[model samples]
Target: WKITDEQRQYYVNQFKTIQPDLNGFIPGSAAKEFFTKSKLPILELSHIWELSDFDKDGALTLDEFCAAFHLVVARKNGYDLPEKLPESLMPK
Candidate 1:
């Protein structure tokens, strides 16, 4: 949620790299490799998925991907991950 506009734009570009299909949502299979490169432990990464997949559809839209990216940065910076994505972080 603390992600700046500049950072969000960066993720949008990154999202396109791994997003082969034109559909807004990308399968977890495709996203896993890109996401895990964050170097966070699997357990922590799993939590990021849980929080970011707002619709619980087992896939991630661009907003969800950006949310996960921000959460990774937040965790590394010692911010507590939330039980749910707050309004500020919700997809516009």
Candidate 2:
């Protein structure tokens, strides 16, 4: 389904509000690669907005936002992920 204008706007705003200045991986880039490599197509902006629940608490937290970005970067670089990521991240 096409991303609705409202959804698009919401996602864009959410990204702007919560996105951290991650160094190694750019925002949206990791999410794109993770979804693509996992055989999922590039999601519409709205769909990605829906999936940014990093805390697993059914809502976006700044930490979750950062973690999701980091996860994608790790997956892309083939880096060995810690059994537990930083304490800031919600435990999986």
Best TM-score among the predictions, by candidate number: 1
The regions of model 1 sitting more than 4 angstroms off are 20-23, 84-92
Clashing pairs in 2: none
Off by over 4 Å in 2: 1-14, 17-55, 80-92
User: In candidate 1, what residue range of length 10 has the lowest lDDT sum?
Assistant: 14-23
> What shift in Å separates residue 3 of candidate 1 from its native position after superposition?
3.1
Best prediction by lDDT: 1
Q: Could you tell me the lDDT of residue 15 within candidate 2?
A: 58
Candidate 1 structure quality by residue, lDDT tens digits, 1-92: 45588887777776777653335787776566676776776666667887878786889987778787787777888667556555458655
Put down candidate 2 lDDT per residue, 1-92, tens digits, no spaces: 12244543443354554443332223455446544655536743224424454334344444444544444434455554343334356444
TM-score (C-alpha, index-matched) for candidate 1: 0.72
Candidate 2, residue 6: the lDDT equals: 58
What's the lDDT of the predicted structure labeled candidate 1?
A: 0.71
